[PDB]
Amino acid sequence: SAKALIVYGSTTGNTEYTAETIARELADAGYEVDSRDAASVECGGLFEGFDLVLLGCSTWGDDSIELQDDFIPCFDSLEETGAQGRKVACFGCGDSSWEYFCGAVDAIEEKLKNLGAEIVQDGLRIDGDPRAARDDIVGWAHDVRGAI
Ligand SMILES: Cc1cc2nc3c(=O)[nH]c(=O)nc-3n(C[C@H](O)[C@H](O)[C@H](O)COP(=O)(O)O)c2cc1C
């Protein structure tokens, strides 16, 4: 039960760094971690074979909440990923200047719940430079593991 998948959408590298930091925490704890940029993934059956799935996505949109571009395809086809009964947790980078702070996390969590996933922890929301939030990221990964 030690297979973890991380799929992230990141344009300026912040959610990518966050994914790398989570991946190391899980691997140190004994998980076999498969980290993938959402740009590279196929949506059909994406979660197959994984005991834990972590989804990272930054938030965009001129005057609406939009997901990072590379994440949109598998969000649109999230019902084909194998999320039913899957343990999942979400993370994302954003900027609290925006009212809908890390709103992509809300959109992904709400759809996952409809699709029957088990959300193992409330999503991690990072403001600004994620390197300045490293302790929060490591602690969240620790807490996700402890809620399995
Ligand atoms: C047009 C635009 C819209 C944005 N909208 C939001 C937003 O609604 N909520 C939020 O938290 N951050 C918003 N941001 C901030 C980005 O999510 C932030 O730059 C983040 O660090 C990017 O993460 P990434 O490098 O992983 O893509 C917006 C940024 C831009 C340029």
Residue numbers in the entry: 1 to 148
Which text from the study accompanies this structure?
The continued disulfide omitted electron densities of the side chains suggested that the disulfide bonds are successfully formed in all crystallized mutants, which are T9C-A36C, A20C-Q25C, V16C-A29C, and K27C-A79C in BRIL and N14C-C93, A43C-L74C, and C102-R125C in Flavodoxin, respectively. The WT and disulfide engineered Flavodoxin structures were determined to high-resolution of 1.20–1.55 Å with B-factors in the range of 16.15–19.24 Å2. A43 is located in a highly dynamic loop region and the disulfide bond A43C-L74C stabilized the loop region (the local B-factor decreased). For Flavodoxin, smaller fluctuations of the terminal distances suggest that A43C-74C is more stable among four proteins. On the other hand, the V16C-A29C and A20C-Q25C in BRIL, the N14C-C93 and A43C-L74C in Flavodoxin have higher entropy than that of WT counterparts, consistent with their relatively lower diffraction resolutions.
Previous studies showed that proper introduction of disulfide bonds could stabilize the flexible region of target proteins and reduce the conformational entropy by locking the protein into single desired conformation. Here we developed a comprehensive disulfide bond prediction algorithm that not just increased the success rate of predictions but also improved the quality of crystallized target proteins. We applied our method on two proteins which were previously determined to high resolution and frequently used as fusion partners for GPCR crystallization, cytochrome b562 (BRIL) and Flavodoxin, and verified our prediction by solving the crystal structures of the wild type (WT) proteins and mutants. The theoretical and experimental results both indicated that with relatively lower values of conformational entropy, proteins would be more stable and readily crystallized to higher diffraction resolution.
